[PDB]
Structure 1
Amino acid sequence: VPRGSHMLFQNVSIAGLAHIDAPHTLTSKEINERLQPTYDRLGIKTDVLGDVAGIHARRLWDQDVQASDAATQAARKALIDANIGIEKIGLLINTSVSRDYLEPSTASIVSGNLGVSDHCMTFDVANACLAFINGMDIAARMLERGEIDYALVVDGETANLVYEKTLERMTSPDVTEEEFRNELAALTLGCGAAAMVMARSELVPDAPRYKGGVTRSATEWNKLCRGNLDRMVTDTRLLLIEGIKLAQKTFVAAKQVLGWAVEELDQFVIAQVSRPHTAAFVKSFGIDPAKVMTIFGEHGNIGPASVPIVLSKLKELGRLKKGDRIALLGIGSGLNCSMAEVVW
């Protein structure tokens, strides 16, 4: 029975991939020592970072590293992984939450640093922790159509400022319990970067394939998590509850469009917000936890870079074999939920 493609991408591959770990460790122990007076004044007796959120450390850059610098570093590594020169790139998309300026795009700055050709189209996409996927899909539409041969999708995240200013606010003798709770999730963020080189499959015939997938939304919840360059306020309770409801709806769509059944997928690459969000997601869907690599423990929540960083760490661990079906998924502020498939 002749079936249609379900609008999945055809002849689009992942030519290269890389991640950068930020160099400075900040432990939750050290954070907790700074917060201890406030914890005592608020009556907080559990370790809300290490024990409740499940974060033991995160990584930070130096204060002068901008999002563009981190993205560039990752892009140069991905080009080496793809064994291609910058001249072959026709499209460069920056997906980070962090951004050097309102104008010009962070993509232009990355592009200028790498020395892209004058044929290279560049722009930024922003969509909280799902944006890397969105950039992949935008590049995949161009590649599938044959307008370009190779595309870079890049993401550098800098959380230094938010940590500095949140820890100041959260150690004020007058911070309120409500304000403290509202800002706490900012101390689960981390720094890092990732980049991916995408290609027409005819150019890279043994490379992994990207199929695309599905998106659903619940934009009546767009107030749940709000952030600027120095502050993020997050209703983590409704993020979890509404996020999982959204995900259940997007998984029904994934069964229809991608044919998914959880038990047939080999790895689930999840944008991870915290350990209880992750456990909840896995239990709700019956996912086998041995298929879910976590880096949140030691790196925290790297935003839209989380997914490609985890995919890059899987690659480097030798955990991915030819033919493995890899689910990329996440719930991002908005709310949005995206689920897509890579076949290694």
Structure 2
Amino acid sequence: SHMLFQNVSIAGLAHIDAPHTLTSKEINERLQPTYDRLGIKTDVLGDVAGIHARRLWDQDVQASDAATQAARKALIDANIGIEKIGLLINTSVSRDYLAPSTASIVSGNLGVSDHCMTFDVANACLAFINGMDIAARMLERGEIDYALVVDGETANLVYEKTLERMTSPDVTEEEFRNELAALTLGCGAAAMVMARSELVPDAPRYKGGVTRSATEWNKLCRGNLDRMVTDTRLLLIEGIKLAQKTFVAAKQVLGWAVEELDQFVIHQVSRPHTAAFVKSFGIDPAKVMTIFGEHGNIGPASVPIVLSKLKELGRLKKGDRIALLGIGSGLNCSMAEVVW
């Protein structure tokens, strides 16, 4: 009985790389006194997490500015003007205010029309995929012809504050390990234009997918603009268990088998998360592009940034079956298919 979306396309896609590099060698030089004054012995960022660098924005780029840049790029990629957009959804973790929606700020910056509906979705690192599904459901019903899904992430504050706390005279060491995951984050932005397939006949098709949850674990990863507290070991383990659930579901509603899929575009928390993941499922590592090593974790923008890089590098061919996979704080796990 389950029907996938059949008239929803991706008309354009774009990403923005933030311009300032902060290396994990430079972070380590700053933290070395504190590493020594408790003899931390391993380089956890570079050697364990597998993050060698991340990007940061210019001072006072807001989430709305970053999303706006990506959106302009995505409109050019779709070859459409802003007057065609009927829905603008912002899916970032970073937000200018509690009200109004960051989506209304981006939409104001772009000059959308008075028919354009706008709102934000929040759902930690899965929100872009939620935003895509929300938009597809409007597209499918005929409410709009084109939608923009946007996401701008700003981590400059979290770096500045996290690094002060960690180089304090007072600073202790249960906190160091609870805080250190904030130094895996990065800045970046992405946007996607989605459309009714009759308007864009050659474009990739979005089929939808499945979601499962384990909300019993909503305590494991709490973040505000200035701080992120995480139980990294436990979110690893309970993530993988939830993904296995979500895979079986994806067997039945999507027809999935690993090996018939051409690419896996996965949210990337760390080299160890990623390796446990692909080993659990026997996925070919070559079908799994990663940017974490140079960009860190860009929250909900990671998925579409990786899809955009796949596209720009020429790796995606007509007919490829693309799996979009995220495990997000919640815990929530969504898995969706695009047919290129």
**Structure 1 residue 38 displacement after superposition:** 1.0
Question: SS where residue 113 of structure 2 aligns?
Answer: coil
Q: Deviations over 1:1-57 (max 9, x none)?
A: xxxx62321200000000000000000000000010111122211110000000000
Structure 2 Cα separation of the partners of residues 288 and 37 of structure 1: 41
Q: Deviations over 1:49-91 (max 9, x none)?
A: 0000000000000121000000000000000000000000000
Structure 1 Cα separation of the partners of residues 303 and 92 of structure 2: 12
Specify the alignment match of 1:340 in structure 2. 336
Structure 1 Cα separation of the partners of residues 201 and 45 of structure 2: 45
Give the TM-score normalised by the residue count of structure 1: 0.98
Q: Deviations over 1:101-145 (max 9, x none)?
A: 010000000000000000000000000000000000000000011
Q: Deviations over 1:276-304 (max 9, x none)?
A: 00001010100100000000000000000
Specify the alignment match of 1:230 in structure 2. 226
Structure 1 Cα separation of the partners of residues 2 and 298 of structure 2: 31
1:210 aligns with 2:206: yes
Q: Deviations over 1:256-314 (max 9, x none)?
A: 10010111100000010011000010101001000000000000000000000000000
Question: SS where residue 33 of structure 2 aligns?
Answer: helix
Query: Which one is further off, 172-181 or 150-159?
Result: 172-181
**Structure 1 residue 206 displacement after superposition:** 0.3
State percent identity of aligned pairs.
99
Question: SS where residue 250 of structure 1 aligns?
Answer: helix
**Structure 1 residue 174 displacement after superposition:** 1.8
Give runs of ≥4 in structure 1 deviating > 4 Å.
none
**Structure 1 residue 173 displacement after superposition:** 2.1
Query: Which one is further off, 92-101 or 32-41?
Result: 32-41
Query: Which one is further off, 38-47 or 135-144?
Result: 38-47
Structure 1 Cα separation of the partners of residues 169 and 180 of structure 2: 16
Structure 2 Cα separation of the partners of residues 246 and 7 of structure 1: 24
Structure 2 Cα separation of the partners of residues 330 and 180 of structure 1: 27
Query: Which one is further off, 129-138 or 40-49?
Result: 40-49
Q: Deviations over 1:189-219 (max 9, x none)?
A: 0000000000000000000000010000000
**Structure 1 residue 159 displacement after superposition:** 0.2
Question: SS where residue 87 of structure 2 aligns?
Answer: strand
Q: Which ranges of structure 1 fall in alignment gaps of 5 or more residues?
A: none
Q: 1:89 aligned to 85, 99, 120, which one?
A: 85
Query: How many residues are paired up?
Result: 340
Structure 2 Cα separation of the partners of residues 63 and 127 of structure 1: 26
Specify the alignment match of 2:20 in structure 1. 24
Structure 2 Cα separation of the partners of residues 17 and 54 of structure 1: 27
Give the TM-score normalised by the residue count of structure 2: 0.99
Question: SS where residue 209 of structure 2 aligns?
Answer: strand
Structure 2 Cα separation of the partners of residues 139 and 187 of structure 1: 33
Question: SS where residue 172 of structure 1 aligns?
Answer: coil
Question: SS where residue 34 of structure 1 aligns?
Answer: helix
Structure 2 Cα separation of the partners of residues 151 and 238 of structure 1: 37
**Structure 1 residue 186 displacement after superposition:** 0.3
Structure 2 Cα separation of the partners of residues 323 and 92 of structure 1: 28
Structure 2 Cα separation of the partners of residues 308 and 42 of structure 1: 39
Q: Deviations over 1:229-257 (max 9, x none)?
A: 10001111011000000000000000010
1:165 aligns with 2:158: no
Question: SS where residue 54 of structure 2 aligns?
Answer: strand
Structure 2 Cα separation of the partners of residues 206 and 235 of structure 1: 44
Structure 2 Cα separation of the partners of residues 169 and 286 of structure 1: 40
Q: Which ranges of structure 2 fall in alignment gaps of 5 or more residues?
A: none
Structure 2 Cα separation of the partners of residues 224 and 51 of structure 1: 23
Structure 1 Cα separation of the partners of residues 151 and 38 of structure 2: 37
Question: SS where residue 263 of structure 1 aligns?
Answer: coil
RMSD: 0.6
